[PDB]
Design an enzyme around this catalytic site. Structure first.
Site, short mmCIF file in Angstrom:
data_model
loop_
_atom_site.label_atom_id
_atom_site.label_comp_id
_atom_site.label_asym_id
_atom_site.label_seq_id
_atom_site.Cartn_x
_atom_site.Cartn_y
_atom_site.Cartn_z
N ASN A 1 0.87 -1.17 0.00
CA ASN A 1 0.00 0.00 0.00
C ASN A 1 0.92 1.22 0.00
O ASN A 1 1.86 1.28 0.79
CB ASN A 1 -0.84 -0.02 1.27
CG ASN A 1 -1.59 1.25 1.48
OD1 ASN A 1 -1.84 1.64 2.62
ND2 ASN A 1 -1.99 1.91 0.39
N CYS B 1 -5.27 0.92 -1.69
CA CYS B 1 -5.86 -0.40 -1.56
C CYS B 1 -6.80 -0.69 -2.73
O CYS B 1 -6.91 -1.83 -3.19
CB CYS B 1 -6.66 -0.60 -0.26
SG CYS B 1 -7.92 0.60 0.13
N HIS C 1 -11.93 0.79 3.16
CA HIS C 1 -10.80 -0.05 2.83
C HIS C 1 -11.28 -1.11 1.85
O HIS C 1 -12.37 -1.66 2.00
CB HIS C 1 -10.22 -0.70 4.08
CG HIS C 1 -8.96 -1.46 3.81
ND1 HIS C 1 -7.79 -0.83 3.43
CD2 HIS C 1 -8.70 -2.78 3.79
CE1 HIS C 1 -6.87 -1.74 3.19
NE2 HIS C 1 -7.39 -2.94 3.39
N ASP D 1 -5.46 -8.69 1.14
CA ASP D 1 -5.56 -7.38 1.78
C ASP D 1 -4.19 -6.70 1.66
O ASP D 1 -3.30 -6.90 2.48
CB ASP D 1 -5.93 -7.50 3.26
CG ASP D 1 -6.26 -6.16 3.90
OD1 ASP D 1 -6.13 -5.11 3.22
OD2 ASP D 1 -6.66 -6.15 5.09
#
Lengths: 76, 347
Positions: B11, B16, B257, B274
């Site tokens: 990131n 994201c 997110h 993630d």
């Protein structure tokens, strides 16, 4: 000419426009009917997100064309 | 050390949304191959989005550690601070695929994107009081599905093809007939090999100028039959789709997110991506858990759910998700990249 826009509520509304209208113009006409601020609007047609500055004839948007209005879910 | 077989993406600040999309397109194998094939020999490695994508894809495929995307954001012509602004992932998808599609025009992989993602719809209009009918065929690269009041993807498609009345304030312009009342109905002519679905999880509230995210429960299946919605079906190729990816948005569009769940091989073996962390998960964690609608809940769990879905046509699956080996990557590319892992060394 008359074109259509599928709104957030999933309903189809009409817009009276001209081939030379800018996407900013169109977003403007949408604010009048739906009340959504142009800066929040995203217009999708033929798989492309219409670019402010360009016009309807630039995207070959003709009479009866249907545009798709979506908003944003920004994330990071 | 860990067992997923796949690597994440670092990131940069608020990227994201970009990372979820990149994993999503990286695992659209057929597209990855097409990108590796693009002619990047004479490209300025700082202005070339195609070279940047090739690089990101190569790393994701060979590295054993998180991949960076700074050269990607640099090729977009962005400054460092631009990586700190949150964005919508479906918006990035529309803009990115268009950009890559144009860059592919004139090359050996020209037309790849429309082939994978573009479909055609038919819009039927008919006047109730005047005998006049008019059709309009339009392409699409994704489908925005209405969520409010819809329990699942089926009610949503049923709603998409539902005939509407062009009434009063929105009467249909016939021509010599002037403004008339009419019915408008939409059907699909074709559904693409790779189907992108944008879940209309929003509503604009006039008393705040804000978009209030819709976190209501909305079910989507692992297997998705869509013949019912095609104007004409084909026996040797039913529109049967298989879930491949679930792009999940967490939060209100006041900060959120993005994460993406995929079963890369289309085999039901899911992993959660993630940013830099890739972890194996259960089908329920990727599917049911992202249905939404967990209210009275005073947690993030209520505002965490599927925003964008990726389905792949059953009949195209083995082609779209065909294994990619080094054999599929051009020597010219591999060498240029390895000459960079060098030039960034002795300096």
């Amino acid at each position: 000419m008359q074109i259509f826009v599928k709104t957030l509520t999933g309903k189809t509304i009409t817009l009276e426009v001209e081939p030379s209208d800018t996407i900013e113009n169109v977003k403007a006409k949408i604010q009048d009917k739906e009340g959504i601020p142009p800066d929040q609007q995203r217009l999708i047609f033929a798989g492309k997100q219409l670019e402010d500055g360009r016009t309807l004839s630039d995207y070959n948007i003709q009479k009866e064309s249907t545009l798709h209005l979506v908003l944003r879910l920004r994330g990071g | 050390k860990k067992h997923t077989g796949y690597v994440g993406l670092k990131n940069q600040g608020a990227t994201c949304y970009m990372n979820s999309l990149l994993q999503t397109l990286f695992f659209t194998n057929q597209l990855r191959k097409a990108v590796y094939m693009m002619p990047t020999e004479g490209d300025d490695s700082s202005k070339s989005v195609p070279l940047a994508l090739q690089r990101v894809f190569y790393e994701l495929q060979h590295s054993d550690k998180p991949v960076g995307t700074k050269k990607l954001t640099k090729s977009f012509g962005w400054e460092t601070l631009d990586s700190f602004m949150q964005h919508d992932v479906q918006e990035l998808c529309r803009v990115l695929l268009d950009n890559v599609e144009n860059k592919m025009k004139g090359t050996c992989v020209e037309g790849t994107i429309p082939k994978l993602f573009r479909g055609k719809m038919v819009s039927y209009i008919q006047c109730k009081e005047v005998d006049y009918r008019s059709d309009r065929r339009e392409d699409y690269y994704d489908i925005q599905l209405s969520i409010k009041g819809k329990k699942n993807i089926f009610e949503s498609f049923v709603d998409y093809v539902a005939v509407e009345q062009l009434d009063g304030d929105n009467k249909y312009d016939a021509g010599e007939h002037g403004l008339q009342e009419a019915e408008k109905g939409v059907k699909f002519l074709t559904l693409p090999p790779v189907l992108h679905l944008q879940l209309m999880r929003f509503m604009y509230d006039p008393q705040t100028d804000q978009n209030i995210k819709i976190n209501d429960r909305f079910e989507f299946p692992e297997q998705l039959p869509l013949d019912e919605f095609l104007q004409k079906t084909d026996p040797k190729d039913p529109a049967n789709y298989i879930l491949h990816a679930v792009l999940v948005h967490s939060g209100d569009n006041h900060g959120g997110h993005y994460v993406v769940y995929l079963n890369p091989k289309g085999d039901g073996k899911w992993c959660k991506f993630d940013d830099d962390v890739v972890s194996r998960c259960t089908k329920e964690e990727a599917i049911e858990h992202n249905y939404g609608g967990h209210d009275d809940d005073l947690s993030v769990r209520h505002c965490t759910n599927a925003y964008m879905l990726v389905y792949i046509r059953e009949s195209k699956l083995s082609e779209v998700l065909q294994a990619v080996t080094d054999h599929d990557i051009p020597q010219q590319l591999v060498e240029r990249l390895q000459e960079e892992k060098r030039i960034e060394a002795q300096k």
